Amino acid sequence: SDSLSKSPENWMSKLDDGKHLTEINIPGSHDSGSFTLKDPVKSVWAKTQDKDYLTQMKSGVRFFDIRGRASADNMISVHHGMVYLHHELGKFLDDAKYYLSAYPNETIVMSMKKDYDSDSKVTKTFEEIFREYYYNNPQYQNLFYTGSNANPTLKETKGKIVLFNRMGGTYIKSGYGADTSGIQWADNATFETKINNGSLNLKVQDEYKDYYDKKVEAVKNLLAKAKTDSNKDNVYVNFLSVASGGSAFNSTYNYASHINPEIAKTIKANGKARTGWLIVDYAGYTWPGYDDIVSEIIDSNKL
Numbered sequence: 001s002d003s004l005s006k007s008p009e010n011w012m013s014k015l016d017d018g019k020h021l022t023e024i025n026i027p028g029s030h031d032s033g034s035f036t037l038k039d040p041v042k043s044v045w046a047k048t049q050d051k052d053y054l055t056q057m058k059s060g061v062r063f064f065d066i067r068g069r070a071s072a073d074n075m076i077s078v079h080h081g082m083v084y085l086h087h088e089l090g091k092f093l094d095d096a097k098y099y100l101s102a103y104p105n106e107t108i109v110m111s112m113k114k115d116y117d118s119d120s121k122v123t124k125t126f127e128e129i130f131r132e133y134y135y136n137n138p139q140y141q142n143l144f145y146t147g148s149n150a151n152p153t154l155k156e157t158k159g160k161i162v163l164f165n166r167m168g169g170t171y172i173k174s175g176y177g178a179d180t181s182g183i184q185w186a187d188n189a190t191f192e193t194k195i196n197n198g199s200l201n202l203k204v205q206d207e208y209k210d211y212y213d214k215k216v217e218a219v220k221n222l223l224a225k226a227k228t229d230s231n232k233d234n235v236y237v238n239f240l241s242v243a244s245g246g247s248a249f250n251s252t253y254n255y256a257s258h259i260n261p262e263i264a265k266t267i268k269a270n271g272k273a274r275t276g277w278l279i280v281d282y283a284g285y286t287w288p289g290y291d292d293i294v295s296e297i298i299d300s301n302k303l
């Protein structure tokens with residue numbers, strides 16, 4: 001009952017691998033690579049994580065919100081909008097690769113989004129650079145999920161990174177939104193859109209501008225929908241992250257320390273019901289006396 005989150009390194013290994021990934025309640029980290037920020041002024045808003053990628057994985061995070069900027073024709077740098085996070089995409093991929101080697105029944109969802117205009121030296125699209133120098137890179141040979149099931153199971157994705165495509169139209173053919181239309185993302189909204197040529201109904205709460213109370217209500221609203229929804233063809237992505245501290249708190253850290261426990265308590269109070277994929281700031285950051293969002297997301301999976 002407590003047991004899954006007691007060992008967050010290997011919690012997916014314990015699930016029925018007949019489950020589709022859409023039916024798994026998965027913790028994600030919003031702007032996953034921002035843990036590298038040390039500048040205290042630049043960190044106030046832009047720093048969303050304090051754990052590195054392997055530590056996030058060891059804490060049970062399995063959805064990663066990677067934002068990129070093309071900084072050479074063969075290279076993607078990891079960004080928070082205009083802010084460079086001091087590493088390239090290769091570093092995230094080397095960690096995931098390593099982690100998935102150690103724990104072969106785990107799977108990682110990696111969201112990929114262009115977060116900033118390319119360096120003036122770049123002449124290719126973000127999507128080509130990603131497809132050509134990362135996805136099709138022989139060095140990442142068996143790392144990505146390359147199957148053609150639009151709605152893959154744990155069994156199918158075990159030990160692999162499944163692409164969650166936020167780049168637009170792609171020639172990549174495997175993963176969520178991997179087609180020439182990509183995912184049609186609505187700005188600062190809760191929205192629904194069919195993806196993978198009509199196979200899946202994507203339901204997203206991404207109201208990233210919300211005042212704090214409205215943001216809490218927006219998360220709770222999509223949790224209440226996921227709760228009664230056993231349709232495996234529906235995918236829920238619920239962002240608990242928000243800009244400018246919800247216009248209520250003085251840093252993204254302060255903001256996270258309020259919404260994360262409030263949502264963790266709500267999930268605990270609802271039992272082991274379907275939550276969808278919840279993407280949080282400060283994943284695996286605990287406050288004494290408060291419920292832990294990543295643990296409660298993990299423990300909401302019924303065995």
Ligand SMILES: O[C@H]1[C@H](O)[C@@H](O)[C@H](O)[C@@H](O)[C@H]1O
Nearest residue numbers: 030031188206208239241243
């Ligand atoms: O800054 C926001 C925020 O990071 C959201 O979670 C993301 O989905 C939006 O596209 C982005 O513009």
Ligand SMILES: [Cl-]
Nearest residue numbers: 036037038039
């Ligand atoms: Cl910095």
